[model samples]
Target: HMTGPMCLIENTNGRLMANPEALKILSAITQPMVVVAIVGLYRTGKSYLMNKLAGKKHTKGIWMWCVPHPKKPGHILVLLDTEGLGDVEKGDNQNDSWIFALAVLLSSTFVYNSIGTINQQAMDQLYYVTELTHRIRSKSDSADFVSFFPDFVWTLRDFSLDLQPLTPDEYLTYSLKLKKGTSQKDETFNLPRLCIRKFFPKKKCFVFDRPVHELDPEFVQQVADFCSYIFSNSKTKTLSGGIQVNGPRLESLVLTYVNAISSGDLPCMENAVLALAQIENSAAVQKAIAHYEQQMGQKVQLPTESLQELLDLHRDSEREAIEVFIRSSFKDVDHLFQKELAAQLEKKRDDFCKQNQEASSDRCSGLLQVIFSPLEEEVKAGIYSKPGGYRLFVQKLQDLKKKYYEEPRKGIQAEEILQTYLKSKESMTDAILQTDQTLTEKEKEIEVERVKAESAQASAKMLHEMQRKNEQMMEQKERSYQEHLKQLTEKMENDRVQLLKEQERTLALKLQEQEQLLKEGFQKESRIMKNEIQDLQTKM
Candidate 1:
């Protein structure tokens, strides 16, 4: 639905506010996204490169241009062109720093555009890189940051230095090499470079020649190389723990960062992920419940003929509900949200069971009344008071039981209701036996014993049937647990592997940096990096 560039984060008088309309565009997207954001000093050709990447470009504060990926099907390419930084008129370095930080936080490919070669002056202009540590805090340390930080690209636009022997990447690497000294002056010289190297180890550089009306082939070639690298290298955005960022997730992140800033708090990556998990998991729980209800309501009619029939329907609905939860939820590592869904589903199942029982009982009572109305009238007329009427009464009750069994759709409570009615007629049957003149005392006593035996048998069978139903329910619960655990374990293992791979990659880069730091005699910084490396190893 998005047609062109729109202001995603509107900057007014140095106060940043996210535009709702832009967020709406993001919320509708479900595809995995590759976000490319450009940040540099104002008027340094940042927008031009963004335009080239977007294949059509512009900006207000942070303009968003989302298009379907040309190279990757079922993916989106989000291009963000931030307003030029270091504007004298804005006079707000803090605002500029936040924009830079957001570009780092949001993008999978972070492009730093500058007008000249990578030199001291150019590094000075990028002091915002040094401030990133102060701006955003991760869950533990920079290791977590490294696991999720964007790949870096520095575009030196309008560069003329000859690097025939050294490639552009080598040139940028040479510029970032630390001065061999412990002096404060050397530290100042190396601070931004150290930050860049530590924060973004996967870096690329491209030096573009000045673009003229004549359109030199070299400049065009450089542009083509730059675009090719970005398109090929940029990955889908993911958070710590390998939680892929789709549209709703990105939309939540936008709000999380901006709201934190709005509330006078520094944006913490760990906190943001937790907050997102809560929002998403809660919603997922509700969605699962809704699905369960929709499925059960449509498939199962009330007053089922047997408990097993209702149980079968519930089992199907519950399984589908759990699948729904698994599909939508993220980072439910402790199974807290999954447990919530399970608990809610259990309650819903119980409620449905109770409703089924109530319906069955009601229907059974109505049918019993209709089937026994004639018997009650005969009893009122004293038809069972005469001699030998006890045998006739017993015969009529047996015939009525047969008639009740012959009726259709009597439901699960049918036998239970009939037994209860027969039990209620026991005293009347005894009275009829006592008044029967045709029966001997011994015969009457034997008849009472037979009636008692039949009643006892019926009650025992009812109790056993109830016990079987309870046992089946427990079995169903076990099945539910098995199903939930299977999916949850699979998801957790995938997350663990994803997180491990990222840590391993970051560790390799850190190990490389530590070696360079040692050779350069920055013992203190190198030791600190070694400890970070140890932490990453321990975590992995």
Candidate 2:
């Protein structure tokens, strides 16, 4: 009766029903896990490595094995197991290359195995793989694509062979933090850290610690306990809340069904598995199970042959379900997966073009600059080179010039245009700062000049008042002298008083002139400073 997204049940037909509990379980299982592809020369045990990782022997055929996540249970892990590229078994088979290319395009990580000494052929294969990866990384929507070279050369002898191996944890940390390389053409190229494991030459097995069945029961239990502890402590596990069953076995089943359907191979009991795998609505599978139970009078067992029919019925359904699952699981504001994919693609293309343009510019300009620049005295002298050598160089340069001038001019123009934009940005920033400073200083100078002008006016008013007071004193003295003349017309004191008054007036006039000069000096300095500030503003 449990409902929601995490309930599992059995229909009357014995078919497993994904109920509310199952839905919750399914929802919990959704995640964008890394897809690592195994690539190497034939007989290098790529499929064997996959088998070990999945904890099962699922690859018995020539096609690539698409394994589901072992630990998580329901999630998909697509494996492209290809035939040996240079093997002569498939006479004139050219399709393998395309298959390899497609695998590289789809994979998030490339695991290249060089089991022995690296030679030209091995290097050539690696180079081709690297090139294809580069092409896809430049153009595809795969943002998680990581370039990895995991050489298993040392492991070819025996699993017990003592050999140093790179730790997975360290590699993961380094890959995430590593910066792009220095070469512009190589900057986007990334090299993932190698993961080395012991290989059993006899059984062709690559075990994590040892064969699962080989361990003692008590030791096995302890290993299981430790595994559980590790999973519980993992960052992904904590973030996901809890693990759900999306194991390798389920993925293998799904792949088996998918291959049958695509190849038009009718599988027995295919309807049941197809219905289960392709069912969009959990209710449809439940209803189908119910109907099958009523018709057959018992629960139907899932047969391998019926897988194709079941898948045909459920392909669209499964796709829809997965799309919904992805959207729901990665609820991010930036839509990180989609946005990052787009950004990475754009950046790759832009960077590629930019690098080529720069190289071309350097090649052309460098050639010209090197030739035109003065040579060393020895080279210039007849001791270093013959005259014919110089003449031949000139001829070659002229021919190169014709080729260069005839080539398309847009790339160089575009670079120059971009440089212009950069320069303009810098100039604008500097101009803004200079203008701001100039305005501030001009404002300060204006304020100071206003204060100086006000002081000068105040000084002039004080001088006028002093002059008026002196005039009033002169008037008072004249009146007194007239009265004294009436009392004693012969009093000679009037001449001496007049002379004293004139001397006092002359001293007062000199003091007034000096005070005016002081005021003028202050105004002159203010004016000069104001002019200097205005000149600074104009320069800015």
**TM, every model:** 0.89, 0.26
lDDT of 1 by residue, 1-540 (tens): 567678898766667899998899888999999998887766687767776777763233577889888788998999887774676444444577888888888889899888877777888888888888888888626555776789999998888688758998899888888887778989999899888889985888989898884688988798888888888889999888777788888888888888888888887887778888898899999999999999998998889878888888988898889888888887785889999888888888788889888888898888889989898889879999897898998899889889989987767788798899888878877988999999999999899999889989999999999999899889888888888888788777887787778778888889999988888888888998999998878877
Off by over 4 Å in 1: 1-3, 57-60, 89-94, 333-336, 374-393, 406-409, 427-441, 466-490, 518-525
Candidate 2 stretches with Cα past 4 Å from truth are 1-34, 57-62, 119-121, 133-540
Quickly count the clashes in candidate 1.
Answer: 0
RMSD (Cα, Å) for all candidates, in order, is 3.1, 46.5
Instruction: Write the residue-wise lDDT of candidate 2 on 1-540 in tens digits.
Output: 111111122122212222343334334434433344455556665545555444452111123333345565444443434444445434543334433443343333444444443334434444444333333321101111211111121122112222217443333233223233356433333222111111100111121333344544643453354334222321121101111113222233333333443354422222323333343233333343334234323222222122222232233332333333332232122333333332333343234334544655555454444443333233345332432343343344346445444544323333333233333333332333333433465664564465457546755765665576456446544543343234233222443465455444433433343343345453442353345334434433
TM-score of 2: 0.26
Q: Report how far off residue 534 is in candidate 2 (Å).
A: 42
Count of backbone clashes, every candidate in sequence = 0, 31
RMSD in angstroms, candidate 1? 3.1
CA lDDT, candidate 1, residue 437:
94
